Amino acid sequence: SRIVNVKLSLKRYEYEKPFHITGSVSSESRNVEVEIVLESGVKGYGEASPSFRVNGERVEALLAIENAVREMITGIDVRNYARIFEITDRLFGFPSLKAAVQFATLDALSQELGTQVCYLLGGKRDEIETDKTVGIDTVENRVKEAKKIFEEGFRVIKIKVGENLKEDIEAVEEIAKVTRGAKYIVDANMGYTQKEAVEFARAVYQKGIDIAVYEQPVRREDIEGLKFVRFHSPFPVAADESARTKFDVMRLVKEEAVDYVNIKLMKSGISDALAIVEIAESSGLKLMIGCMGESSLGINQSVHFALGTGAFEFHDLDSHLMLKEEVFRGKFIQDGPRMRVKDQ
Amino acid sequence: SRIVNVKLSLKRYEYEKPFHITGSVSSESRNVEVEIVLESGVKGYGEASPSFRVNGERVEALLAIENAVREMITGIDVRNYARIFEITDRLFGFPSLKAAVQFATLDALSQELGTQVCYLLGGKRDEIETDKTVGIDTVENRVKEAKKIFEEGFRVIKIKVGENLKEDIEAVEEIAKVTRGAKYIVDANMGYTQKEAVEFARAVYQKGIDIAVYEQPVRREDIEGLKFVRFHSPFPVAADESARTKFDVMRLVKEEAVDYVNIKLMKSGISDALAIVEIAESSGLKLMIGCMGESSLGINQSVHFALGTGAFEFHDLDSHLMLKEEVFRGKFIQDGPRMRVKDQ
Amino acid sequence: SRIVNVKLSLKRYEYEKPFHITGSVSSESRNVEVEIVLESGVKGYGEASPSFRVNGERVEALLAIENAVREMITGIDVRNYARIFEITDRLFGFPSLKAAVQFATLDALSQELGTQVCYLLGGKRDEIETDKTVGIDTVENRVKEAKKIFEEGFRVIKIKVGENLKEDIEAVEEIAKVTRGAKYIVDANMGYTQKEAVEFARAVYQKGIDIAVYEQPVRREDIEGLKFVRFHSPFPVAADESARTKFDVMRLVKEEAVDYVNIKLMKSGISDALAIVEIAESSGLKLMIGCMGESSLGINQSVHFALGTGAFEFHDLDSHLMLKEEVFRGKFIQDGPRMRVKDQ
Amino acid sequence: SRIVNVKLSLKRYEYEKPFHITGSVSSESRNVEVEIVLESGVKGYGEASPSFRVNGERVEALLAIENAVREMITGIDVRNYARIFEITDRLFGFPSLKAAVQFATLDALSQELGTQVCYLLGGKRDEIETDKTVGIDTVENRVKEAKKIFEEGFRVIKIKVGENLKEDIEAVEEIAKVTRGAKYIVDANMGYTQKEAVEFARAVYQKGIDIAVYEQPVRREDIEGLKFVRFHSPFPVAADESARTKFDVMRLVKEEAVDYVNIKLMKSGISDALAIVEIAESSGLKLMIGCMGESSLGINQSVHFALGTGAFEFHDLDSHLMLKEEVFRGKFIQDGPRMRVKDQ
Amino acid sequence: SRIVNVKLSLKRYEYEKPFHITGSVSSESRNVEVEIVLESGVKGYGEASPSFRVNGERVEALLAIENAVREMITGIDVRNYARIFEITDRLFGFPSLKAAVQFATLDALSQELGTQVCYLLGGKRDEIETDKTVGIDTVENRVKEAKKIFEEGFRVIKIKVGENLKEDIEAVEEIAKVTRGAKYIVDANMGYTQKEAVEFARAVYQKGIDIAVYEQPVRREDIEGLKFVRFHSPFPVAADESARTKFDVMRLVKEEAVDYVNIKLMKSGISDALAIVEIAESSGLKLMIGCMGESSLGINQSVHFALGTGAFEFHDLDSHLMLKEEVFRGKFIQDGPRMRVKDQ
Ligand SMILES: [Mn+2]
Ligand SMILES: [Mn+2]
Ligand SMILES: [Mn+2]
Ligand SMILES: [Mn+2]
Ligand SMILES: [Mn+2]
């Protein structure tokens, strides 16, 4: 049935503690929740968690375009969801809102069909497992946090690096010693030069440490640099900030620049994310899925995407786990590091 | 709900006249119909129209593997269709059967969800239009046939060439004269050398004739030859036989070999065809969709695929129109050269 | 001296008639004017003319981030303009505002230094000349409009094409006949396939018509397509939508994709535009400068940029001339199609 | 205001001790000071420190063209500095004089505007820090000099190598032991083969020594050799002699040959140096700035360039620190290894 | 025997009329004559005809370095000429002087050996033939000048173009009409864009005119542009300004940029010129030899080089023929457009 209203609302979520990554420290997520209302009375929901650093977005700006978004899709039947996806692909300057609107569309459609979004998308998996992230801090505090995560039962530990190469090498080496059995993802958030990035990898390799995925060591535009790291260090290299659109991923594949792509709905929307999954499966690329600052309602989007496509070797879906005092609003089951589909 | 049976049956369909293409002439279509039965009682249908020349398939061979196909997917819920797609991707030696089983799966699922396959696939378009094909014959007979097609309301005329460069040039020029306003697709079915293919295009261009799509002038393995034709003649060049899998298309894109890909479900199945649509839309590829010897139930698969994805500039879905007075078994409206979505 | 305030204000300007280009028609320009106030009392001005189609921007979104922009640069001395440029490079999601803030900074600094922005930028030229644009309409109306422009003294005529290849060829041929001596720029605003773009160029060449610059015939992401047109047609090919950032231009240069780049301050800001001038002058790129929907105060930014750097073979700075009777608010002399530096 | 005179004068500066690099030993700098006099009475100053080895120049030859230089720019207003830059770009056979004249122009212009050259150039930084260089000598003497430099408070030590691979490896390893905490730049001044250069780097890497920048290990024309070193050894590789012009740098970027460029005003002039900064910032290249045999008045040129653009990770501006008995004639503050902008 | 003195002297030669080429017009040749005196009493002679536009040289600068040149080679036996060549290769900033000194060396050695320079170089040919050049002027005057040249017995006519595409096309077409049977070399001296250069060639080709060699249509640094012209127009393309050194030529060969190189001793010296001959003969390069403003003593250098190596399809050795009534000072026979070896 046809969309009759679209509502955007500011929702704020406080962190338990400041989240520090290369070039950014944040203590709060300010997101935009999207509600799509159909003539049937069905309501679908999405969440835009904007990124100034990655997408150039500001939450004030997303909220400002409510009327435009409404006018762009009101009157369209959610069964013609490809029309909605094409229209919302015009929101390339507001990719988090693109994502939220596209997901809300599928959330509404799946209800009208008596199913769930993961099933519309293929129903490949019934369960996925997330890592949890260690932010930047003193070496001692990074080690402490990594151990905590390991004690919580997380089997993959994501470690932020990028601001201090020497301390980064030390932190990862100390973490490895006290979390024997864990797999490690290292995310440099564009902090290193090509040569610094190679040296980080070599240093930890020399201690017999294996890094499962080494994310975006160099700047967004430095595709040749990503390739250099890939070809001169022993760990799989992922594009994150360099992989926002489906066109970005075609370029990465053509240049043989990466082993992995980290898909985020907040970069790509559902439309480009689906294209990227297909490109990757046609090209020997492996995939992980990540997040920005989504609450449980926002993480829901990626949970259904990951369950449905089953495309991901790794899942970095932990933003909702970093919140101070939250009421759970996902349409999935959180069970420790695992997420599962609802019977209903 | 879960698959409880899978049935394969031989179905034969007679042509109105022998269909002559480069290196092949046939008077009959021998297809394998697939029925999937669910525990709910819902039945989904697909059709495999095999190709010995393109896929290396034989109809007897498809029939012989009924028990294997049944064992592979019985017990799986169609809501987990990605699992069925991944399993049936193992049928790469029987791609027409891969397509039929994958479509039958979606036919059944759409019924359980109270919708149509085109809608599962995005519901992008409500209407498409097909060309109709002029087979190889004497120049006089080719012209007669083209005039017949034009008087049946077709606005796009597909002209088979490839066995006689001089007569092919003459036939196309004479056809152009008696079908003013039509658009032309020329399909050489691998018959020309790269230089012959260039000279065919040049000869027709010099007469002021525009060819909308120039399909597969050279052999399947001759990607560099396809590229040569692309870069040295004025009309858009399509891969057909060179584009069977999603991997083939990634290679064509990397090599900049073609302007178009002709997707056929009988080459790719649903899984690879969806991948190819995504790759093309991420790479400035244009698309057409074609067929083998599908009857109306078989063409239904492509009609829903094309309506739902809306991915195609041109449609060459005319096999059922070349067959001799069948009872109509599609789930779409055939409106002269137009196909329209049902109500349902 | 130091910035003490930054003010953003909505300013609307009516067109003389609807401006139709490939995929877009507008009757009004809604811009954001930027005022920077220094502790000295000096005020500098810029204008953001946003583009949804090219930059993904919306005017409401620009307005919404006034406080953020103010916080980002308040307290900084305009003599340290490189610091302001680096900070405002973070506004990559709001490139038109990036441009306006960067220019306002130089407008204020030049006043404190007792000079003009063109002189800060090198003072290369005292005079430039702009084309004027023929929008899409019926062939008869396009010809009427071109004749009007020719009788207004313009020596370079920019002709929009892209929606109808046959009518575009006819319009350009008819325009050429009634504007003998004019030079022509043809802007396809991404409307053609690579092969259609080649055939447009060939058709006009065969009539003995020379096109000075053939702008962006293909889509933004289709760099290989741009190169194809460049290598297979006789006129200089320009990137417009494909050249937004300095990084885009390095890629175009590496791929040998174009003969020209059309710099627009609304895509690049001052910072990337200066980089692009330097890259082009180091690579055998030629340059033109264009606009969006700037009023006279907005066009001033480009006039000073073009006068100072002297980098452009062609100038397409006509947006203010398409606007309905404004009070002139430039800091340059408008002398028919010519712009000249002030005394001051 | 307009240039009314240009004067060239020979100035000789004796070194405290002979400076030995690969293929060259010198005990004195013979420079050409440039004075530009304006009609306002303002006087701007530059210095050409010619290089026979790098630029093919001889000081006698620079002095010989005084009248030509005068005639080329007399009567031009320094506010049109781009015109002066374009004219003096014709002095590509006398690049040190090109640099001196271009800087003298900005020195005069900045006085007329009531500011400083660093501010005309962006005012990005208020302070920079230089390394100091260890020349070639016996291993013992090289170690002694490196220790002295470290004791002087220099945090980056530049070590000349290139004439004796075995002794070079020994010297760098011994230096590292006695200067723990220092960063190292190694400059081979074209002395090594590709394979020798890789082996030098590997040998020192094996002792746990990090080289911040490894400059020009191979000959000027051996771009492929520079790339080979870059791709097969662990340290960032810089072009110096291979990077004289902006066109050279475009080639280096296209070939992915280097991690760094060492800009010297004496190679590039201000015009090409500014282009190189822009190219580098558009291409993932990092930068250092170096010198020839400039006195304090000559080093002033690079100090303002480096302060203003803030483009450099490393500064090798130490030629004026190697002089016997000199009267300071810079327009900056020297404060140990640091240089700072004047309040005035 | 050993060099005991080296003398440089200014020699001026007046043209018959101003010689206009793209971006340069001159009425006089100011050359530096080199005399090398041996202990045996034998004297060898060379001539440097410098080029500011191509080499960046000034005659005053060449004169200024007499003492340096003398110190560099005095005391060396001319039988060890490779030592003198390697030393004078250091004069890369004064390439015309490099050439003059290297030739004077061979002039002296050949005398001591009782032979001629052409014989030292292989004695391949006894006779060569030169073109003569039509400078830029009005179309009427260019045609007049070409007719004059044709009536002086020249069979190859070199036509300068580059400043006015339309008039250049007209001039060449009119010249072709009045010089039936002549071969044509067209030298654009870097005046055209790649596309303008293509269109010049196409326009003349369409008139049935063949251009034997089309020299340097684009700028020195624009190697990719040279290649573009080569691949997109029907006449052989030559590098002139882009081929100064042996390293330049290796790059041109690797890039497949040209059909021809124009060797000039004033760009390359004897050493690089011999290298270029060997490279060309190993790569399917064809060669022509040109000049700057050499008098008869200067042209002698090129005549012996061309006679001895026999490497050139075309000779453009006409500078002495454009000079106003000189006493003949060559060591060859000038026989109309032909040059022949002496007896001795
Ligand atoms: Mn990441
Ligand atoms: Mn076909
Ligand atoms: Mn445009
Ligand atoms: Mn160096
Ligand atoms: Mn020439």
UniProtKB/Swiss-Prot annotation, chains A, B, C, D, E:
Cofactor descriptive note: Binds 1 Mg(2+) ion per subunit.
Known function: Catalyzes the epimerization of L-Ala-D-Glu to L-Ala-L-Glu and has probably a role in the metabolism of the murein peptide, of which L-Ala-D-Glu is a component. Is also able to catalyze the reverse reaction and the epimerization of a broad range of other dipeptides; is most efficient with L-Ala-D/L-Phe, L-Ala-D/L-Tyr, and L-Ala-D/L-His.
Gene Ontology molecular functions: L-Ala-D/L-Glu epimerase activity; metal ion binding; racemase and epimerase activity; racemase and epimerase activity, acting on amino acids and derivatives
Coiled coil: none
Matches recorded under Pfam families: MR_MLE_C, MR_MLE_N
Gene Ontology biological process terms from the UniProt entry: cell wall macromolecule catabolic process; cell wall organization; peptide metabolic process
Gene3D superfamilies: Enolase-like C-terminal domain, Enolase-like, N-terminal domain
Keyword annotations: Cell wall biogenesis/degradation, Isomerase, Magnesium, Metal-binding
Cofactors that this protein relies on: Mg(2+)
Cysteines engaged in disulfide bonds, as pairs: none
UniProt organism field: Thermotoga maritima (strain ATCC 43589 / DSM 3109 / JCM 10099 / NBRC 100826 / MSB8)
Family membership: Belongs to the mandelate racemase/muconate lactonizing enzyme family.
Binding-site list for substrate: 133, 158, 189, 291, 316, 318
Active site: 160, 264
Catalytic activity: L-alanyl-L-glutamate = L-alanyl-D-glutamate
Pathway listed: Cell wall degradation; peptidoglycan degradation
Annotated Mg(2+) binding sites: 187, 215, 240
Catalytic activity, EC: 5.1.1.20
Protein name stated in the entry: L-Ala-D/L-Glu epimerase
